[PDB]
């Protein structure tokens, strides 16, 4: 039976202690962008460099 879960303790050890991992996996060239960063939006400027 394949599962066979972990075993931890408060003082189990630094390696034995659980590093909560969040795998933020990004794809930057997958589709039109839907989520962006927190930047203030300025006024739109036309006909200028």
């Amino acid at each position, epitope marked *: 039976f*394949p599962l*066979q879960s972990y*075993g931890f303790q408060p003082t189990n050890g630094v390696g034995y202690q659980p590093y909560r991992v969040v795998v933020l996996s990004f794809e930057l060239l997958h589709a039109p962008a839907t989520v962006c960063g927190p930047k203030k939006s300025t006024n739109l400027v036309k006909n200028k460099c």
Partner: antibody
Framework: VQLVESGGGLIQAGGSLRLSCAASGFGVRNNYMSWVRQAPGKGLEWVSVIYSGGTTYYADSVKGRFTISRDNSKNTVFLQMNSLRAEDTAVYYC?????????????????????????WGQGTLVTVS | VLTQPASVSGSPGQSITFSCTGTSSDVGGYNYVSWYQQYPGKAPKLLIYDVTNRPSGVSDRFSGSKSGNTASLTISGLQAEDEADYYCSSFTSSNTRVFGTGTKVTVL
């Protein structure tokens, strides 16, 4: 590794019990969780074993009575005792089978078969009276 | 049920060979036999998983073996604390494990 046991007590014939075995340092999932009875001054006649998941393996002489389950939330293996008979009178051990990398033995890689026994608890006396 | 020799008494230092019988279903064919040691009241401790292999914390003089339907223990150099019954656990014989009766050793 520590194993604490409870549930045994003096009951009349045809009663019910609930054997509780809580494991600290390992779970009921890590290694095979066996049930053994050691009759006073006799051998240890194997009763049952709950593996890491989903087993109904029993001995030839105790078929169809013992029911084995776990509450994984509290890490407890339960042996619910119904329809006692004479031969079940013994001291009962919840046995931790030798987990993966048994005593860091330098030959066995992840073969969890390893049908031997690791350290156990203090044992519970289960008496039919 | 594997059969083992009964209670015996002896001298420290030399070798005692305890052979225990079995069936061809478990010992003769399969090779997952293990042996244990217990002190009355305390739970059994592992002596020889796989018989040939020896866990740590155990004196190296303990040695066991299997021959056909029989399993042999070649124990060497007895001492005072060694007086305890020796239990033979073979393979689970198509998922129903079996043991021997027990060999209670005595010393002077």
């Amino acid at each position: 590794v520590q194993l604490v046991e409870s549930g045994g007590g003096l009951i009349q014939a045809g009663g019910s019990l609930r054997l509780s075995c809580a494991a600290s340092g390992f779970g009921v999932r890590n290694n095979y969780m066996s049930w053994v009875r050691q009759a006073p001054g006799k051998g240890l006649e194997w009763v049952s074993v709950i593996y890491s998941g989903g087993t109904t393996y029993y001995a030839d002489s105790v078929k169809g009575r013992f029911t084995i389950s776990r509450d994984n939330s509290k890490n407890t293996v339960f042996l619910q005792m119904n329809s006692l008979r004479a031969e079940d009178t013994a001291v009962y051990y919840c046995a931790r089978e030798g987990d993966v990398e048994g005593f860091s033995d330098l030959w066995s890689g992840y073969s969890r078969d390893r049908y031997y026994f690791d350290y156990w608890g203090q044992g519970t006396l289960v008496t039919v009276s | 049920v594997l059969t083992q020799p009964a209670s015996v008494s002896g001298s420290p230092g030399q070798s005692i060979t305890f052979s225990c019988t079995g069936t061809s279903s478990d010992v003769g064919g399969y090779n997952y036999v293990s042996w244990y040691q217990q002190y009355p009241g305390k739970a059994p401790k592992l002596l020889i998983y796989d018989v040939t292999n020896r866990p740590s914390g155990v004196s190296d003089r303990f040695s066991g073996s299997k021959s056909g339907n029989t399993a042999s223990l070649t124990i060497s150099g007895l001492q005072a604390e060694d007086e305890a019954d020796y239990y033979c656990s073979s393979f689970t014989s198509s998922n129903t494990r079996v043991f021997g009766t027990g060999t209670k050793v005595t010393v002077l």
